[PDB]
Design a protein around this ligand. Sequence first.
Ligand SMILES: [Mg+2]
Ligand SMILES: [Zn+2]
Ligand SMILES: [Zn+2]
Ligand SMILES: [Zn+2]
Lengths: 147, 111, 497, 164, 97, 441, 56, 112
Amino acid sequence: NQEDSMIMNQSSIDRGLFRSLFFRSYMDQEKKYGMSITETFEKPQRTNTLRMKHGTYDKLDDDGLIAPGVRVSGEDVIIGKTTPISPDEEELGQRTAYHSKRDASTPLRSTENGIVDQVLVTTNQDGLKFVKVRVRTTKIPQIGDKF
Amino acid sequence: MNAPDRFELFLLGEGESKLKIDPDTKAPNAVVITFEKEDHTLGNLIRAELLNDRKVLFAAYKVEHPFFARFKLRIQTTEGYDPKDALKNACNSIINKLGALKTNFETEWNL
Amino acid sequence: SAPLRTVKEVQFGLFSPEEVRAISVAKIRFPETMDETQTRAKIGGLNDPRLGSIDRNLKCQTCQEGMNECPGHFGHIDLAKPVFHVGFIAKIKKVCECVCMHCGKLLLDEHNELMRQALAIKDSKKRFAAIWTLCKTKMVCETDVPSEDDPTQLVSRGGCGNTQPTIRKDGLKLVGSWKKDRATGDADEPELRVLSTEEILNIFKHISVKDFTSLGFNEVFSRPEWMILTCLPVPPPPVRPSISFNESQRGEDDLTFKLADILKANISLETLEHNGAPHHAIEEAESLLQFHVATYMDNDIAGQPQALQKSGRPVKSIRARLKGKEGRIRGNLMGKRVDFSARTVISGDPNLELDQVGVPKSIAKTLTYPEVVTPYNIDRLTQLVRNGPNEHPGAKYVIRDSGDRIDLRYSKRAGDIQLQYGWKVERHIMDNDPVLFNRQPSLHKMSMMAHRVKVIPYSTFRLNLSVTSPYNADFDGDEMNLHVPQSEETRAELSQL
Amino acid sequence: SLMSCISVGTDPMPIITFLSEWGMEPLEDYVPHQSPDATRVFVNGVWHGVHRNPARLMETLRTLRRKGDINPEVSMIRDIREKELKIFTDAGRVYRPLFIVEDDESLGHKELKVRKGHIAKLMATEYQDEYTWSSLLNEGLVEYIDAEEEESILIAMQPEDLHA
Amino acid sequence: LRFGEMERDCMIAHGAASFLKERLMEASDAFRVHICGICGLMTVIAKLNHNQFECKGCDNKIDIYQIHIPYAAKLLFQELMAMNITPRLYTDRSRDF
Amino acid sequence: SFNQFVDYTLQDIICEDSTLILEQLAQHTTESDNISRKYEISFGKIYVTKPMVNESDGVTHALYPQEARLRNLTYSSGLFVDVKKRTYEAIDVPGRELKYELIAEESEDDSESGKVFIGRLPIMLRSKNCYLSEATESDLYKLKECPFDMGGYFIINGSEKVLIAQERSAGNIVQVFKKAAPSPISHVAEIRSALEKGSRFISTLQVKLYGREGSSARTIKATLPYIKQDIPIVIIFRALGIIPDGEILEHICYDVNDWQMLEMLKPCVEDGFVIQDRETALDFIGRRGTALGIKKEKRIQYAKDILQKEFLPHITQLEGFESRKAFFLGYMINRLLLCALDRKDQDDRDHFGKKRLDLAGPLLAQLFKTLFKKLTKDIFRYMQRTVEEAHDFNMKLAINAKTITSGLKYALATGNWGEQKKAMSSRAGVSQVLNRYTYSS
Amino acid sequence: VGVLAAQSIGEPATQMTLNTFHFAGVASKKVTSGVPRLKEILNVAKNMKTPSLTVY
Amino acid sequence: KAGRLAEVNLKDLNNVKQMVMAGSKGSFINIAQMSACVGQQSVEGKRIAFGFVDRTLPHFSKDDYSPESKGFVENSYLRGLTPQEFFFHAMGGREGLIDTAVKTAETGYIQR
DNA sequence: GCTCTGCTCCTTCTCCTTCCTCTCGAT
DNA sequence: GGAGAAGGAGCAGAGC
RNA sequence: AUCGAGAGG
Ligand SMILES: [Mg+2]
Ligand SMILES: [Zn+2]
Ligand SMILES: [Zn+2]
Ligand SMILES: [Zn+2]
């Protein structure tokens, strides 16, 4: 405790001194205008997805979402948003096969690490499906924390 | 994040023997012993008993850093009194006193 | 492969119209962009007419080279009219205020001791300033110039004989005021009119080499005439990144959009004057071209009319792209973001030696060092490879003599890879490594010092109390930076200095 | 600050009417040298007229504000030295609530208008879970003093103890 | 992390010349570019597969050199060229003293 | 503050210039002797609904904060205003009488008003227009709201934003202070004045004391609205109808024994001997102010219009100004001289009593006002062009209804209260996201 | 020695919280000091706030 | 003088005194203000100015230059400051805080 | 003696900036 | 904010 | 990708 540094009782920390709970929310929207291209939510596949991220999608359900209680860490994908291949001039869909299912998913921030708390599925005033995911994790006082 | 495993406070790891005895070069009949996974809960007993032995010239210890459960013990004795054996004697002594402590408590408790 | 050299001299100068075309590899003739309008290509005369390549494309002056070792190439724009360079309008004005106007000779000459004193100045930047100062007065292109000896004899050097109009600055145009104004009833009061860029250009071409030198310049690297733009150079994609907005969209650099605007303005003149000319109304298109060119170089020249981009914001001109703080020189050149570095919170640790620093295992694991495989360390290095990239005494990428980088995160040959002498192993940071450690703001040498690494648990940097005095540090949440040396030379340099 | 409030402003007309009602003379009829000691009456920066007994005028105006006839937020500053009276109904003014001192209490010397009984009744109401803050205003127990009006105010700290 | 102006100032005060070279070029921004010996501009068509170069405009297919320079500096020079200004890089100091 | 806005100010903004006109009286139409036709729109009472959801399928729902936050909705209510459509059918009655609007009034078709949709208005939580203003603690639990949430904020696209009070100088005040010795002015009375009755004006009168008393300070001049050059106060008074000397000082010096003030005033009167004719003074002002137009009167009436409507705008629409305004002018001059005479010290520019805070009420008042004007301006030109506005107004209003809704929303959403052009009087930071770490934060 | 001297002079200047007073002297020391004075010196201001001429 | 009275009568046991004697955090004035008179507060090198007409606060009569009316604090930090002293102290503290910001902008530029 | 040809003696205008770091939330 | 750079202006001398 | 805001040192 030499400067403004301090000595904290580890046993007290163990019991629960200054322990806190942290929440973070993610979100995404269904799509824009269906001009020969639409966007949605659905679990992607390594061989049936174009420009897939370097994380994982095996924690996603049918609609690309994760049920509460599931432990999700780091680069793990939480919202399996998909957006059709756009190799053409108009930036719309295209007559391709495996790569037609181009994704546009959302994962956790690379430094995050916790479990899914709550998932909300609604629509905006434009009738567009909206996904919002809240996750949580415990913060336990470290030697770099400020008090 | 990068916090150490609490098991490392008392359980020996791979390649970690409990004790390591090195010979000092700064003085004759003197050794330095490393206690792995062991703080001065035990260490302070050892020094205390060593200093009750009139054939011991030096007995002291230090914990070089609190991040690690390690304990340095330095022992210097008079000629012929191998410091290693001096330590062995200190241990025997401590245990014998603890045995009596237990017995006296149990008796006092029963009464 | 050409011989490797270092730069010893930088010679500044101006491009000569012809020179621009000489180095130009594209005529540039279409005020249009990517895909020629839905062709899944570029533009026959813009973006990729053998110019800078784009993703998955090669060509680029037939040299290919992808987009790695492949500098872009310049095209050019043949301007319908001469355009004042926005950065030289002040100088152009001053030069015209020194030269006799449509003569090519300065107002003053040797026949004048005050002028001789100015001419004797070696410092060109001060010389032409002195000359200009003197030439602010008596602005008449007198044909017969009074001799310093027996003034009744004069030198007939003034090829015009008339008066030299004064010049007023008006935005991007210069206004001539032809002195005249004869005392006998104020006849022909200083005739006012905007001086044509072409008039001035021709005058600059008339100016002799002797007169160039007198006002500075350099008949090889800079001429007065080169202050007027007649042929622009076109920056390649590497300079003006086309960008890939969101998902397969464009959003090309402001310069791309602005250069297109210049082409449109130039073409406007090209067809307006050529075909259905409207006499003086053409000047509006001339002004348009002048405006776009001047503003693409510099979006700020007093006159309220700042060029705005259709999105509702100011156009980021070249000047804006490289001025002040966070602008090339001070932004990306004099200071810059670097690799092999770390930052985190510090805490005190009285059990470290003065010159040590406690570095978290996660940082020691992250940052690496390219140690060379020799007969004196191959034993250790092969062990580190076997340890893998998951140990705080481990290692990562292995570099072969071929230049191959072996990513140990994608390898099942941890115990199979045999290091050869001369290879490199990008190992994790080891104890006693020399690293540079500092605190911001850095006010003096003491804020930058080299420490010996000690790999520790937890996630803060650990310091000896006494070293905080020079860092001016405390432990109430301060953060410090690590800079890790890569060459052996720099490790020695830090450890010894 | 915890008890700092900001005015929402109101219509100054009512007051202007009162001013003329109480003898405030229009500038069209004002003859400076004829009545050199007249007090200049301003409302929200508008010099409406003058008055020859501003002391009595303020006695009435203050009473009206305390009664609730004039919206409590209205500020009233009498400058005894420059012979001016300023009234503000302007929105955005910052003001603070103070206890009213009334040395009219003939039971002794200078003392607070707020008496224990007001507190007893007030507290009672506070624990009935009828007095409320606005009733303290209606009874003329506290005032809203803004930074400008403070120039003419003398404020005691702790009335329990309270050279002035 | 940004190696700021103050940080390089201190390395100068220390005299760490090779450290700065490493941190300012080796640790980020590095580009090999061919310079025409006649006119010090980056206009050489480096056909790195046939070893053909050619300045074009100077017709220099022989006297060129390689420069190892920070990419950002390359941009500066090209952005100067964009304003009709030359920055002629010479590898042979003609101004002896 | 917010309640004050929706209770009164909102209606007053609409009330001001609530009508739009189109008197196409005696025009051309060769078939008749200058045909007469007229149109007029009249906005009346505004109605504010409770926060309402507008679904993509046209279905509406009572919007509760929590849902707004979860579905990224803006917590706004519907604005409806009485809008009368007065159509005056072309009467086609050849003659001089077609120049009158009265004969046009005879063909009036008074189309009903009713609740005509004007736009949406973001509602502050727990305000008079919010559900939570009456909800009890138990009800708050039913609505999943927090019983401790004060609610002093807006919800925009689900984001909880708050308007930060902004400090400004009070208007309609007299600021007498010393001007820097590097200038040519010794003392100056900065008179900030604004007719905050709608049009605002917000003009400044600069009464200047030039240099030292041994020099040009002998004569005081003032800067008038639009007038490019400074004008001697002695001329201004004469222009205001105060010619007679002595009287001209009577409006300034309020003490016949104050010879020191009179000393400084004397030279002003000396300069006043140049112009003795009020009309000439007015001419002087007009021709000095700008290019000599209105040559029929050399801008005398022009000068009068400035003095009547711009000069000290907080006292206007009153011919009595010849005495009243003259007194106020001389008053300010008097105070300026008191400073110069060391009778009074320099005004404290940091005095908190001279400051004002703009709250959600006053803030939205300014913002909405310009949005409302934009609506009426667009409609106005469409009514002029359209052959019978009765068949176009119905749609053009709706277009501008969206304009106000999205314009109002945007400003609050980003904090950029400009015109989306170039930081037009930007106040970025006026609307901030609430800090949510502790109750106290 | 250039940069070194620059840092040597620039650094400790950050400790000058005196501005114009709090240093004391024999005569009525109304003399610009601390950072304000340093600025006058380095800028070579033509109009310093405190001239003062010492005559022996 | 008040500070010295306090200082002199501190025992060597006094922990604050020991830190001061060692030279590790602390000084005479720190002791003086904690144990004795905090002292005269000051703004821009002057005593508290008359921000109100002829006075510093609405709690004082006009034309009063008595020490405490213009920022003199008689109490120690131990004893506690009275409302007026507190505010006057806050005013002095404010200009201090301001200067610590301005000087970094100014010396940062100078240094460069 | 008286305008004239220079000044130099002023007043009246345009231009610029610790470091560094983090996050969100708009377009 | 406090420079610096460009410009109009107001007088000792000086030649016809 | 710019742009503003809130903070930390
Ligand atoms: Mg700190
Ligand atoms: Zn190429
Ligand atoms: Zn000529
Ligand atoms: Zn070349």
